[PDB]
Symmetry: C5
Subunit: 311 residues, 5 copies
């Protein structure tokens, strides 16, 4: 089989549609997600046209091998999609209506800057390479683009599934290629992060601040050092759940800034003890009394500045 010939000099229009059946496995570290969907293709092949009168059939079914099917591939897949042809239907004018069910692991980058309050646009790129005979161009049949209502992605809210109707036509290895951009808009469900990471992390920090109402250096050293260890435990936990970014993330900034607070609290605790030993507890008392106000204030201000910069 060869491509359908041009009546006039026109390129072949392959109408496409993707209908999500299932979406799963959004791997943050890998920046990948798995998809299970219907891929619909439609093109005109005059060679397959027939008269319904002499045939007695309004449609004609063909096996994939029997006819010419445009070679449609996904740009951003890990391995080539697992596809199973559902149905191939030919109308009397030779209009082919193809339908396959596929599953693929899509590689699409994520912006972690606002984690865990981030939204993402996942992309699925359809592509077709033009042949020497004729040029092949993709189009979106919006009637055949959608998603099942039950489509869920664990830990994410599925906003929309749409297609950028205008293809990106360009040359690659001395042949033209028509590229289409399907978009899955999702926003992270930040709920869990509050009682699991954020609040426990604030409690341990506030506990370190009780050292500002204590004169016992040994108790203070314990308070500040122990809580610092718990902060390291959470930092490590967070960095395990995320890839290494060339930028700072929101949570990453909060976490880093909290280290400075422990470092300064250690300095205060050290200073207060030194003065007490040098028989000048009145200076020490002033610093400790200031610290009780300064620490929550500077912490609250820095957090406002950060949230402002990030949102």
């Amino acid at each position: 089989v060869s491509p359908p010939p041009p009546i006039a000099d026109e390129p072949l229009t392959v109408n496409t549609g993707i209908y999500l059946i299932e979406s799963y496995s959004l791997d943050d570290c890998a920046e990948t997600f798995k998809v299970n969907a219907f891929l619909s293709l439609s093109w005109k092949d005059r060679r397959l046209a027939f008269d319904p009168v002499r045939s007695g059939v309004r449609v004609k079914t063909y096996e994939p091998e029997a006819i010419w099917i445009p070679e449609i591939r996904f740009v951003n897949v890990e391995n080539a999609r697992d596809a199973d042809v559902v149905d191939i239907s030919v109308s009397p004018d030779g209009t082919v209506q193809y339908l396959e069910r596929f599953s693929a692991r899509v590689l699409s980058p994520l912006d972690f800057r606002r984690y865990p309050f981030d939204s993402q646009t996942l992309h699925i790129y359809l592509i077709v390479r033009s042949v020497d005979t004729r040029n092949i161009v993709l189009a979106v049949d919006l009637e055949k683009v959608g998603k099942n209502d039950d489509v869920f992605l664990t830990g994410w809210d599925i906003e929309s599934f749409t297609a950028v109707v205008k293809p990106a036509n360009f040359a690659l290895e001395d042949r033209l290629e028509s590229k289409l951009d399907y978009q899955l808009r999702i926003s992270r469900q930040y709920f869990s992060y509050i009682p699991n990471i954020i609040l426990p992390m604030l409690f341990i920090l506030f506990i370190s601040w009780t050292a500002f109402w204590s004169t016992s250096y040994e108790a203070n050293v314990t308070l500040v050092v122990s809580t610092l260890i718990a902060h390291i435990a959470f930092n490590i936990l967070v960095e395990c759940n995320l890839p290494k970014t060339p930028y700072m993330t929101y949570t990453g900034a909060i976490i880093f800034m909290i280290y400075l607070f422990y470092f300064v609290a250690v300095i205060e605790v050290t200073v207060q003890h030194y003065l007490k030993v040098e028989s000048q507890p009145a200076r020490a008392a002033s610093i400790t009394r200031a610290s009780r106000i300064a620490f929550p204030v500077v912490f609250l201000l820095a957090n406002i500045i950060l949230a402002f910069l990030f949102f």
Copy 2:
């Protein structure tokens, strides 16, 4: 091969049945489970009918390629099922008896709200897309729906395996789809959670309450801070075994509330020490004496309120 033709205008009824041989790999984080079962298909093809008196053979056996078999797929599978045809038998009237053995990874969401005292309903959705010639409709042959007695799912009690007899017929991409709902009812074996997570977590909490019978700030700071670290270790362990939910879970609520108890115990320990230093140990003594009663009481009440809200 093409679909069997309608005598009158009737849709084709494909009788289905799933018989579980094995169930395994219930992944809580992935919200998936693996299944190994028999899939039975039954439909009438008059073109295949014969005479039992003259043919001498009651049943005719065919190879998949030889006859028309309806394209039955699973909605909620990760990848398309691994299937092996066991047998195809044709009765004289042309009733076809298809039997395949398959294995598949089923994606079915889980409700973690009552963890680890939760029960789940796992779903397996069968589907058939109607052809242009005739409409195909699924039905449940309850005779051919079941499970082996030895079917086990590690850490779960298998309650039942049933099918919702009435299919969900609906239009999808200008064709009829017939969807069936097979249900696997399971309930979690919470036993282990008691000596592994619950009791150790209560012991460490109680140990922090011994600070209410001590005047040593340094010892108290150690008691409360150390036990708090062990609580963080268990919180992290629990969150590793669970996916990120947009809601609170039972264990999650208990764990979160316990943090507040440590935070308040630190406050009390701080307050008691401050008063002792300000040479007013009678006030301190009152607060500590109150704490000895208040802490177990408020803990026990809060737990009743929580269990009430969750069950």
Copy 3:
């Protein structure tokens, strides 16, 4: 091809044999193991019979496609076995001798009650479904059941590989099914658990008991609380290496009981201290002196009781 016809009304006897070449990947959590073995099948097909004189050969070699081969499956496999036909030989009297080399992931439950001093019986179930023409029944050719001497299973002692000669015949979806039980008997190599888990765990517990020869509350609180943390670390390590059981395991019981010892040691340490502060160190001295004997005694007795209940 169709099944060999019955001379009299007899069922077809398929003689089976499994010869282990390799045993590996015993996953405790998954309750699975991988196997690489020879599967031998033998049955009589009169239609295949010949005369050695006329033919000039005493054996006939066919390709799988050429003859009727019984559809033998494994009940307890994750996915259908990876098989490669080694040879198919026909005797003049129509006795077929089939040999395949296969590899499969077998799902077989494990009894963790006596861990790490447990022995297991791994099962491999062979099955055959009867056809409408004739009934098929499995048998064990003990001459063709065995294992290579070099077969090893990391962290386990391979006791025996035997077959239960009498098949379990039963009805499934109105057809006779012949089930065979091949058994691999193994016992765990508990050696490692002594210097890795058991002894370190006893040392930390004994270290906590040095608090019984100390009057320093602050030092005691440190001794008891620190060692308790190390015990949590080991409990978590152990539970990672094991699945969630609806029963208690031997190690699990020891681990749980040790928690009670830390809890009581904390009480003693608290009591003693409280006394000293109330200016009554003679009572405190009595309790501490009792504890020095009581703790090792109650620990040693409880361990005898436990070992008795478990073995």
Copy 4:
């Protein structure tokens, strides 16, 4: 089909090109990366030549099975590449133009010496073995070597994708092998390592140095020992993210040297206490006062020496 015959005694030149579509999964421990690219092959086969004017068709399109294609393999792949032929085009003169889309896991060693400030040269080796008829030789068509602009590798900057134009021709198992070297130049994005590993690690070390402004042995022991534990936590974290090297890495050297600092700080803390107990706090005071300067100075110098040796 057999290879195209030599006009004169010349070896067959297969022009090659690799165009990266996607690059992902750079596993540091495994020293592997996954690639998705176009593989282009061009050679000339006079048997396939035709007339442009007479035939009317400028280019003829064949199916892989129809013509002779050189057996091109990758040297450094884990498993043989997953390839799908996109197009085969024959010019009148008989120049074949082959194009496949492939995906493969490439095993290419990494130099960890400068981690996390390292750059790597990933290799992809193309190979062809000669046949008995004629010798096959590879060449690079630089016009068909490249990468998509959107090619990204998480945690790395993609510098270049080039080919060493001249093949490595050599004999292996008494036949000619023609090997080509495609190079992917990448440099690590060290940004993250600063707020995640480097800075937290320096803070805990500076905290240990506050022991130089304290006379409390008990507080010092806590300061130095606790911070040492946090340093062990980071060392373990780092070694989990890296393979075992027969050499020292930059981070590895910093980490190791920091251990010496804790060891010496413990000695100082021990020495200072011993003198204080021996009623000679003037000597102790001198050592502690020296330590306050010596520690940051020796640390800063050693780091300069190390960075010098490593860069």
Copy 5:
């Protein structure tokens, strides 16, 4: 296709050769390694003899399906090898030259006794089963056995790749089997273990011995207990990187013995404090002074004894 016929009663000699292209993934816990190599096979099939005059070509090239190929398998593979036929060459006399490129996961046991100073002999066993017609026997063509210079195995030194020329011929399931032993000799690169596990582990141990120059029970309890925790952390790390052995390993012995040192140090620290409280610090002083010498001496001697027993 059937086996070639004997010309006297001789068994068929299949000459074999394995040429390593790549070796990777040496999994210590799984006791497996992955290999990518050429498998060369040579036997003579007189039925394939040809006159170059008539055929035109001096050497004929066949497709695997076209001719008889001896069924060669690997004994110790997890799953059957992934093979791709590179070439099948037939000389006029009928000598067949078969070349395939394969990849396989080889299961070969490891001796951990001297870890991390151990050397291993990895095995790859080739096997052939004799047919009823004629006996097949394997031979090594040493000219076709080797490895690429660039063959590397992360964390190991590749010593040699050789074959035991004499096959192991033996009966199995009433047929003859010809087994060949290919050996890959490797030795572990212990470098990393020194700054990563060994030295940090010694530093923490020595840090505890500073308790021998202190009279502060509270400080000593902290020193000894804290360092003990760090030792548990390293023990766990080490046991994660190793399988459970029925014997002791070198590192395992060192690690276990170090536990005894902490246990005895706790006893000394307890004893010293008890005497100090009983107002007899002169006895305490003697024990502590002895400990300062005894501990490093007994540690150094025990290590000599251990290294002696292990090497």
